[PDB]
Design an enzyme around this catalytic site. Structure first.
Site, mmCIF file in Angstrom:
data_model
loop_
_atom_site.group_PDB
_atom_site.id
_atom_site.type_symbol
_atom_site.label_atom_id
_atom_site.label_comp_id
_atom_site.label_asym_id
_atom_site.label_seq_id
_atom_site.Cartn_x
_atom_site.Cartn_y
_atom_site.Cartn_z
ATOM 1 N N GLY A 1 0.807 -1.204 0.000
ATOM 2 C CA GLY A 1 0.000 0.000 0.000
ATOM 3 C C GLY A 1 0.846 1.263 0.000
ATOM 4 C CB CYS A 2 3.596 2.380 2.154
ATOM 5 S SG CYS A 2 2.626 2.296 3.664
#
Ligand code: NA
Ligand code: NA
Length: 158
Positions: free
Chosen positions: A46-47
């Site tokens: 996600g990051c």
């Protein structure tokens, strides 16, 4: 009146360690817009998605005179590796002591595992040229987020 969050005065003078080995401060960004996006961990799915999304939009942020900073509590070396692998052309703050995170109140608690567990909640903020926090996004959903932040910035910059 237009601030959605109030930061301690000292926050603006905290030395923020960046990827690449320099430091910045929020006060040093006076006169231009600043996007500050907090994320929980370098090099995760996600990051990484979020960072790549902001990276792809840099020319649009530039058009608006804005700069971006990503923030997590990972080390400078971790950040250097993440930036180099992904090709990021904006800096990452190594907030190892969570001073900047606490100022923006992004360290959130969850009752899990029979414990009180504290961690970075993905969150983004828009800092005006005069150092006011004028918009916030908390518990951020990565999909569509950087686009939404850009749109909000353009609306404010008028
Ligand atoms: Na990486
Ligand atoms: Na600013």
């Amino acid at each position: 009146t237009d601030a959605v969050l109030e930061l301690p005065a000292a926050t603006f003078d905290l030395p923020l360690s960046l990827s690449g080995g320099t430091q910045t401060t929020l006060r040093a960004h006076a006169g231009h817009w600043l996007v500050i996006y907090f994320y929980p961990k370098d090099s995760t799915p996600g990051c990484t998605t979020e960072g790549l999304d902001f990276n792809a939009l840099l020319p649009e942020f530039d058009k608006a005179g804005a700069k971006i900073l990503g923030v997590s509590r990972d080390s400078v070396k971790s950040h250097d590796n993440f930036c180099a692998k992904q090709g990021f052309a904006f800096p990452l703050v190594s907030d190892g002591d969570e001073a900047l995170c606490r100022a923006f109140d992004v360290i959130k608690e969850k009752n899990m595992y029979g414990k009180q567990v504290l961690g970075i909640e993905r969150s983004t903020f828009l800092l005006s040229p005069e150092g006011q926090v004028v918009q916030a996004w908390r518990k951020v959903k990565v999909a569509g987020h950087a686009d939404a932040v850009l749109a909000a910035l353009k609306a404010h910059a008028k």
